[PDB]
Design a protein around this ligand. Structure first.
Ligand code: NAI
Ligand code: NAI
Ligand code: CXF
Ligand code: CXF
Ligand code: ZN
Ligand code: ZN
Ligand code: ZN
Ligand code: ZN
Lengths: 374, 374
């Protein structure tokens, strides 16, 4: 009784940067060709959403943000073949068109049809499906999950197992998969290795989980919020260090702790100084440093290229290096086979209409992931 | 009639930067325990030698430079077990102690006994075996091959096949092996890939050889000296471009030619701007960029970390990543098996007394490698 109709729902609308989300009435157009309209079930509060509010990440405004979520398909567009109404799905902020050079490449997963390099904030067709107060609203990374109903392109949605728990697997839409894959797929952490993880948020804890499952012997967590240390050790960190506790830059301390440098370091914060510090603290002849955190907009860092000439490898990745549409259903199956845990990451559960409050939990440091439920 | 005696011979002493080499008479102390004294037969002129003369690379002065070379063992010290008097050898500007954390690592080659991170300009015991005009002279990278005789620590010398032509395998002491390994061992160039090589000197041409040996489909050479293009195509380049011919930045031209970025790029010059350019011109989701050139001393570059977050890999290496003492004798055997060619790299052959004109052949852009014979 909704298929082909404009839907009546409510969504968290951002009107200007640095302002709270305005819960308002929105009009969600029905799906066009190769498009999917999804009833939302559960969505996470990711730091990347906050970067939109802070201006750290620049996308066209006004927008409905949100990108870490899982729901039920409400209706399908002309030509849709991968999902039907009633399937559980997870929208993909990194699409997998399957037709570009990156999708055919064995390693790449940053599909060229992505809306992240030059943000337009539209569907693949360049228009918007969202109307609030009669004005057109931008999409976010082709997902826009801060809504009871959203519409996504087919290449930005993955059908997942019909028995999966939606309040937990929504993190496979971003936080967990990014951190987990950064360790096991991007850095490719080895057995018996020593790792250093900068940032103990949701992504950073997932990096720790991946390092441990990869068989690392030492995992050093680094965070200026010592309240994060308990859960970091819970998921696998062997030690935690607070840079504010030392009179030396943390890279010397880490280099001394690791008897000459760690095998793998991860920057999971999004600051220029910690990216160079993370690179410096891995072993100069064979260390690998992976940038996961997002720096603010337009920022050049400074580094001495002698740090690389000695033998270091420096790399980054989106979404833990996973080809999104292929990997997400597999990761959900893995979760159901209890191959990894997601509950350590969920620190509270709130109803969706209280999106704004749950955000201040993130920026005040009490939370890892808050799950907004619908 | 020399074993155990001070030898008095010719040496090219460099007393200060930006001035010619002073060909003179020096006193070469006999080897102490675990040291080897070598009669030099052939030495190549590497750009890294020129960097000490220009101050680009700072090592203690006065010095006997040279590090790309081959000779015959004159005598060995007490305890030497790997070489004997009469052996053909190549001194290793990167040692292989075999005992440090890096030597034990499967992938690393930058042995912690190197004299490159913190140059002392001495033997491993901290003293010098060179005396010239009253003064003790500094060693260079534990090799100092611009001398009739040098003394090197055992961990810095490799025994090679006795049927080797020293006038041509000396390039395995640096130039060839550095470029070749940067492609086949560090980048791991794949078959059918497109590569970009910045800098078409001896090291850069060896990168091209490695890319071709690795089965690259396109190899784009980049040099502002268009006289380098012929010999580059000879050893495998499919295309060459001169940045001075373009109005738009060369990485734009290269991304352009490669339909979105190359698979592998190599900086083999030693300039900060070209290292950033080489990185930018590889494909943003899965490109790999390798720094081979040495920048001027203590200089930072500036770059946008978003270039890595999309999926690029940025790394460097000393000596093409080869474990020196293990690889040099095996590379010589490969040359002896005609598995690779060194002739393309040798453009001039001069006697050691004309060291200064061979340096001027390099600085004028006329030569690739000049081989000095004693
Ligand atoms: N590459 C990708 O695909 C993705 C990147 N990200 C980015 O990774 C970062 C983390 O995401 P979340 O875990 O959700 O964020 P978070 O904000 O929850 O955790 C970040 C941690 O960094 C700590 N921190 C802040 N400044 C620090 C400093 N100077 N030194 C040490 N620790 C410091 C904080 O105490 C905090 O605990 C963000 O930049 C996010 O935008 C997030 C998802 C996907
Ligand atoms: N990483 C390692 O283990 C080693 C590093 N090196 C360094 O590699 C670099 C190259 O070594 P060589 O081939 O022997 O030097 P080279 O001087 O023989 O070749 C350098 C090439 O760079 C070209 N060039 C200079 N400026 C350029 C620019 N803006 N754009 C494009 N091309 C430019 C020059 O025309 C020249 O052909 C040097 O920095 C050398 O010190 C050398 C041996 C080992
Ligand atoms: O967190 C989800 N997506 C992020 C990925 C890194 C760049 C900013 C957007
Ligand atoms: O060319 C030989 N050795 C070089 C290696 C890179 C640092 C400077 C010295
Ligand atoms: Zn996210
Ligand atoms: Zn694609
Ligand atoms: Zn050299
Ligand atoms: Zn060693």
């Amino acid at each position: 009784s909704t298929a082909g109709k404009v839907i009546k729902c409510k969504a968290a609308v951002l009107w200007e940067e640095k302002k709270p989300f305005s819960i308002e009435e929105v009009e969600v157009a029905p799906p066009k060709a190769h498009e999917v309209r999804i009833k939302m079930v559960a969505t996470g509060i990711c730091r990347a959403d906050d970067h939109v509010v802070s201006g750290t990440l620049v996308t066209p405004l006004p927008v409905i943000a949100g990108h870490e979520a899982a729901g039920i398909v409400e209706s399908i567009g002309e030509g849709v073949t991968t999902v039907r109404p009633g399937d559980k799905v997870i929208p993909l902020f990194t699409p997998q068109c399957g037709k570009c050079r990156v999708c055919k490449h064995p390693e790449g997963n940053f599909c060229l049809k992505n809306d992240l390099s030059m943000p337009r904030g539209t569907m693949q067709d360049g228009t918007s499906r969202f109307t609030c107060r009669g004005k057109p609203i931008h999409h976010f990374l082709g997902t826009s999950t801060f809504s009871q109903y959203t519409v996504v392109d087919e290449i930005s949605v993955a059908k997942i197992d019909a028995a999966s728990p939606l309040e937990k697997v929504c993190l496979i839409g971003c936080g967990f998969s990014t951190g987990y894959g950064s360790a096991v797929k991007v850095a490719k952490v080895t057995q018996g290795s020593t790792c250093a993880v900068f940032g103990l948020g949701g992504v950073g804890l997932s990096v720790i989980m991946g390092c441990k499952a990869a068989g690392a012997a030492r995992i050093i967590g680094v965070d200026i919020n010592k309240d994060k240390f308990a859960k970091a050790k819970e998921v696998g960190a062997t030690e935690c260090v607070n840079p504010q506790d030392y009179k030396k830059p943390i890279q010397e301390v880490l280099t001394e702790m690791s008897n000459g440098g760690v095998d793998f370091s991860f920057e999971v914060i999004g600051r220029l100084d910690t990216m160079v510090t993370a690179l410096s603290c891995c072993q100069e002849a064979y260390g690998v440093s992976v940038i996961v955190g997002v720096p603010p907009d337009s920022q050049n860092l400074s580094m001495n290229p002698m740090l690389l000439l000695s033998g270091r490898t420096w790399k980054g990745a989106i979404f833990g290096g996973f080809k999104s549409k292929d990997s997400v259903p597999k990761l959900v199956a893995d979760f159901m086979a209890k191959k990894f845990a997601l509950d350590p990451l969920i620190t509270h559960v709130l109803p969706f209409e209280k999106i704004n409050e749950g955000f201040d939990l993130l920026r005040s440091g009490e939370s890892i992931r808050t799950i907004l439920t619908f």
